[PDB]
Design a binder for this molecule. Structure first.
Ligand SMILES: CC(=O)N[C@@H]1[C@@H](O)[C@H](O[C@@H]2O[C@H](CO)[C@@H](O[C@@H]3O[C@H](CO)[C@@H](O)[C@H](O)[C@H]3NC(C)=O)[C@H](O)[C@H]2NC(C)=O)[C@@H](CO)O[C@H]1O
Length: 159
């Protein structure tokens, strides 16, 4: 059970999606801290919503889409289409992230941590959130300390 829409999610809806992601990536070898650092980012990017378009601008593939706001959306959507996966889908977006770790895509090592180090890290959710922000997301505004608060929130409130 997950929410997938082009709409901002409430805290209760986010928590449903966030527990789902935690469970999924735990089975694929990620630490709870690394997952929660990324969740802190996904909350700012998309309110942890796999259906979310940047500005709620549905169908604009030049802009951000999905949990981490792949920008241009086509970066992700072309890959899903090419792989035979439905693009507007929680698991499809999670499979993209695993694909990126495996193929060293998306990540630029700006904090002396590789993507493979990151998913195995037991540093704080706050620290990992800031690393993930700087290395993976890289938005125009680098100053979003909220992502670290949010990572700590999920680490505390999820199982
Ligand atoms: C207005 C705004 O901030 N829009 C946000 C997007 O900027 C952001 O997506 C990220 O955009 C950056 C900068 O364009 C991307 O980084 C670039 O990626 C390419 C890799 O092909 C590389 O050539 C550049 O060196 C690199 N530039 C920099 C400065 O790092 C980055 O890949 C995008 N991130 C993702 C996940 O797709 C998204 C996500 O934060 O949010 C928009 O709101």
């Amino acid at each position: 059970m997950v929410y997938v829409s082009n709409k901002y999610l409430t805290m209760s809806e986010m928590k449903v999606n966030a527990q789902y992601i935690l469970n999924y990536l735990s089975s694929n070898g990620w630490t709870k801290q690394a997952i929660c650092g990324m969740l802190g980012n996904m909350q700012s990017e998309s309110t942890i919503n796999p259906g979310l378009w940047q500005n709620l601008d549905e169908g604009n593939t030049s802009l951000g889409f999905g949990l981490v706001q792949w920008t241009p959306a086509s970066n992700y959507i072309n890959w899903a289409n090419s792989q035979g996966l439905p693009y507007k889908n929680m698991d499809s977006e999670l499979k993209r992230i695993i694909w990126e770790v495996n193929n060293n895509a998306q990540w630029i090592n700006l904090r002396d941590m590789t993507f493979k180090e990151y998913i195995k890290s037991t540093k704080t959710p706050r620290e990992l959130a800031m690393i993930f922000l700087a290395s993976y997301e890289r938005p125009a505004n680098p100053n979003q300390p909220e992502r670290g608060d949010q990572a700590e929130y999920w680490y505390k409130n999820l199982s």
